[PDB]
């Protein structure tokens, strides 16, 4: 079993960018530090996503999630009345609106869309574009 590669060099960060919707883009690599996974670096705006939904160029839209603290669930008396420990509340949708857009040509971009925006919600309900929630990482 070969060890993973280990190279080292001097690199120059890219110039920073302002896409209007997001800012950043100085990571010069194609992969990240903790995980060895490719980084998405194309950004899709709001009107762009709306048109891509209307004209069928978009297939699946995925949101990230968040843990939803235990005190703020209503399915059992509050923890503090001393009952048995209830398992765990379901997770929320991402409050920050971080989203991944998957096209029909295989492209994958990111975007910021608030869950519950009127136009996008109506579009997703009408055109039946697949909507998913990305599970939480361990």
């Amino acid at each position: 079993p070969a060890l993973p590669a280990r190279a080292t060099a001097v690199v120059a960060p890219l110039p920073e960018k302002n896409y209007g919707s997001l800012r950043g883009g100085r990571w010069p690599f194609l992969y990240d530090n903790v995980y060895g996974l490719p980084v998405v670096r194309q950004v899709a705006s709001y009107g762009e996503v709306l048109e891509g939904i209307r004209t069928g160029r978009i297939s699946q839209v995925l949101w990230f999630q968040a843990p939803r603290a235990v005190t703020a669930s209503a399915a059992a008396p509050p923890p503090g009345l001393g009952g048995p420990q209830q398992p765990q509340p379901p997770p929320l949708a991402s409050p920050d609106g971080r989203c991944l857009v998957r096209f029909a040509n295989g492209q994958v971009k990111q975007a910021v869309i608030p869950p519950g925006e009127p136009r996008i919600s109506q579009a997703l309900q009408q055109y039946g574009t697949a909507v998913s929630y990305i599970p939480l990482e361990p």
């Binding site: 503090g80 009345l81 001393g82 420990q85």
Partner: protein
């Protein structure tokens, strides 16, 4: 889970709830629903006197 003072307080609330659940709080002997059925008793107590 929770401290002991919480358990004492919960025990006292359970005591109150239980004492209410026995359906004895509406009984007042000076009622009218009471004096409707104990009129003959007092009448015969007075005529037996």
């Amino acid at each position: 889970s929770i401290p002991t003072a919480s358990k004492n307080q919960i025990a006292l609330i359970r005591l109150n709830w239980a004492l209410n659940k026995t359906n004895i709080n509406t009984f007042t002997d000076y009622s009218k629903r009471n004096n409707l059925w104990t009129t003959q008793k007092l009448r015969n107590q007075s005529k037996n006197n």
